[PDB]
Amino acid sequence: TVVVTTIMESPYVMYKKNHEMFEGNDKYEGYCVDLASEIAKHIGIKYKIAIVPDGKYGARDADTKIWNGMVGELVYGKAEIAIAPLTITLVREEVIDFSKPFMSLGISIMIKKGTPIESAEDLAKQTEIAYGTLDSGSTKEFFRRSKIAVYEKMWTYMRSAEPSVFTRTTAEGVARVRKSKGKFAFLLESTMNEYTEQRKPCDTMKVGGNLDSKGYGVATPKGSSLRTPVNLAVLKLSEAGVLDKLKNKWWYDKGEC
Amino acid sequence: TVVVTTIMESPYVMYKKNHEMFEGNDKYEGYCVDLASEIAKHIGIKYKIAIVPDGKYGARDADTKIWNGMVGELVYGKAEIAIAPLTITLVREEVIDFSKPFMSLGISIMIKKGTPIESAEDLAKQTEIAYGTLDSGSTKEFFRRSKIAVYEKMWTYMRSAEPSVFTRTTAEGVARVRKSKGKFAFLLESTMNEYTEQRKPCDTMKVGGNLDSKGYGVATPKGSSLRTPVNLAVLKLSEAGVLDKLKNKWWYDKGEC
Ligand SMILES: N[C@@H](CCC(=O)O)C(=O)O
Ligand SMILES: N[C@@H](CCC(=O)O)C(=O)O
């Protein structure tokens, strides 16, 4: 039985209603739950969903050199596959493998409706509206590593902001936007942004274009015999239109706005 | 010296003005010429651009089973890398390797301006306006393999249309749209469509959403020592913003409409 690391992140992996009465995999639902079932069926594996203990995507500590999050679970042999909105990045590709993308996305801006912001440049040239991002993820790294003036300016502000503008979870970031009367904006992936825009109370909005262009991949540890089967499975699911059906199912068919 | 297979396709690879006075690689310009230069610089190779002799992207003949086009050049060892708008597909992944995507795209519809068509459904529901696609590529295979009702209907029409609606080159398809007074539409990748929309005589238009979501990758033959270096170089260029800069350079900075 293959251990699948994943993360509680709507609408990828969520608790069922009355999840406490279900056992194992049956506790959970969502895009990545369905994707896990689809891949497992295609490659012929039994699997067990294990929610990442630390609740993180995956970053490397500069001192200890230790990987945390889902990336860590793969690197240290605690999971055999990651099926999650895990961004394909250079630093991760050096330690784990990724399938070709199952979803395409870019970093984006979430505002409380009515906030006078439509671009990164708009955020960077002002201080009346605070902004932040998820901790320990690819978005934070994007800003830390950027050599583009506008993003450098945003990083310089965010890294020194007090109280901290980096959140433990996406939901925390969203909640912060919603309660801050337009005075906090959140930098997050277009996928999560567009999902939240269709959820009650319908008070948030994606503004401007995406900051970058990238993808999520299904990840495996180096040397895994699952690498090629997984890659081919993702491509088959893409070409068969199943990935499109799954996105429509979890984003738009269930839309509330 | 690494042999780089590529294809004459605007704005990826084009002849310089007065190409005839230049030698070797310096005869060419375009997005993929710049990409090859960037990749070679990162991985430390010398290279020679070789335009694919048959002028095809690459398909497997059902009878003889032989790969043609750029895919063929790699499979039979006539080239060491493909740097071109080559779509990452399942059937190709079975015979060659691809980097993670350097460009994201989907199939789209090109019309002559004023054509009463806004969607694939619009095309499938009528017979007055003919429509087709490129030979030996991923768009043709998309329609052949689709089980989506609308696309099945389009395939059934296109495969048996007289005169032929399939073209040998993208340029042929585009010329046919421009010359056919609204009575021909062309199915091609969003990237090519968007480029053409910004070129004189500014008489074409992309209509409707993309039919799928996929990527172009830099391709290498199985067992190539260049596989990993190429993959990391593409991700490095992505993360540094170079891919975005090159798209802007070749699509929009050079817009004519
Ligand atoms: N998908 C991101 C997490 C979300 C974010 O950083 O915006 C990652 O893999 O790290
Ligand atoms: N990029 C496609 C060719 C263009 C098309 O098929 O529309 C391929 O690699 O086959």
Swiss-Prot record, chains A, B:
Residues shown, of full length: 416 to 795 of 902
Subcellular location(s) per record: Cell membrane; Postsynaptic cell membrane; Cell projection, Dendrite
Extracellular-side segments: 116-257
Protein source organism: Rattus norvegicus (Rat)
Disulfide bonds: C202-C257
Expression (tissue specificity): Detected in cerebellum.
Other noteworthy facts: The postsynaptic actions of L-glutamate are mediated by a variety of receptors that are named according to their selective agonists. This receptor binds AMPA (quisqualate) > L-glutamate > kainate.
Modification after translation, per record: Palmitoylated. Depalmitoylated upon L-glutamate stimulation.
Residues reported in the UniProt entry to bind L-glutamate: P85, T87, R92, S138, T139, E189
Role description: Ionotropic glutamate receptor that functions as a ligand-gated cation channel, gated by L-glutamate and glutamatergic agonists such as alpha-amino-3-hydroxy-5-methyl-4-isoxazolepropionic acid (AMPA), quisqualic acid, and kainic acid. L-glutamate acts as an excitatory neurotransmitter at many synapses in the central nervous system and plays an important role in fast excitatory synaptic transmission.
The name this protein goes by in its record: Glutamate receptor 4
Family: Belongs to the glutamate-gated ion channel (TC 1.A.10.1) family. GRIA4 subfamily.
Domain comment quoted from the record: The M4 transmembrane segment mediates tetramerization and is required for cell surface expression.
Gene that this sequence comes from: Gria4
Subunit structure: Homotetramer or heterotetramer of pore-forming glutamate receptor subunits. Tetramers may be formed by the dimerization of dimers. Interacts with EPB41L1 via its C-terminus. Isoform 3 interacts with PICK1. Found in a complex with GRIA1, GRIA2, GRIA3, CNIH2, CNIH3, CACNG2, CACNG3, CACNG4, CACNG5, CACNG7 and CACNG8. Interacts with CACNG5 and PRKCG. Found in a complex with GRIA1, GRIA2, GRIA3, DLG4, CACNG8 and CNIH2.
Domain of life (superkingdom): Eukaryota
Organism lineage string: Eukaryota, Metazoa, Chordata, Craniata, Vertebrata
